[PDB]
């Protein structure tokens, strides 16, 4: 339980990139792979 161990000085810091931003990065990479292929990694899509 998080609120049984947090009372001893332990604190869980939230990550910088949330799940939504990681999902957006994943969707962008998938769209670039499907539409462009390998061109969006070297230069323009």
């Amino acid at each position: 339980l998080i609120c049984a161990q947090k009372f001893k000085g332990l604190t869980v810091l939230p990550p910088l990139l949330t799940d939504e931003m990681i999902a957006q990065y994943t969707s962008a990479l998938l769209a670039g792979t499907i539409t462009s292929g390998w061109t969006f990694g070297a230069g323009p899509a």
Partner: peptide
Amino acid sequence: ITPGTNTSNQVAVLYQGVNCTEVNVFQTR
């Protein structure tokens, strides 16, 4: 959080883990 003493002296405080209702303000996760 400070932009650096070389450019400004303004600072911002962040209380990591509270709801900021027992102490501009912007409630974050």
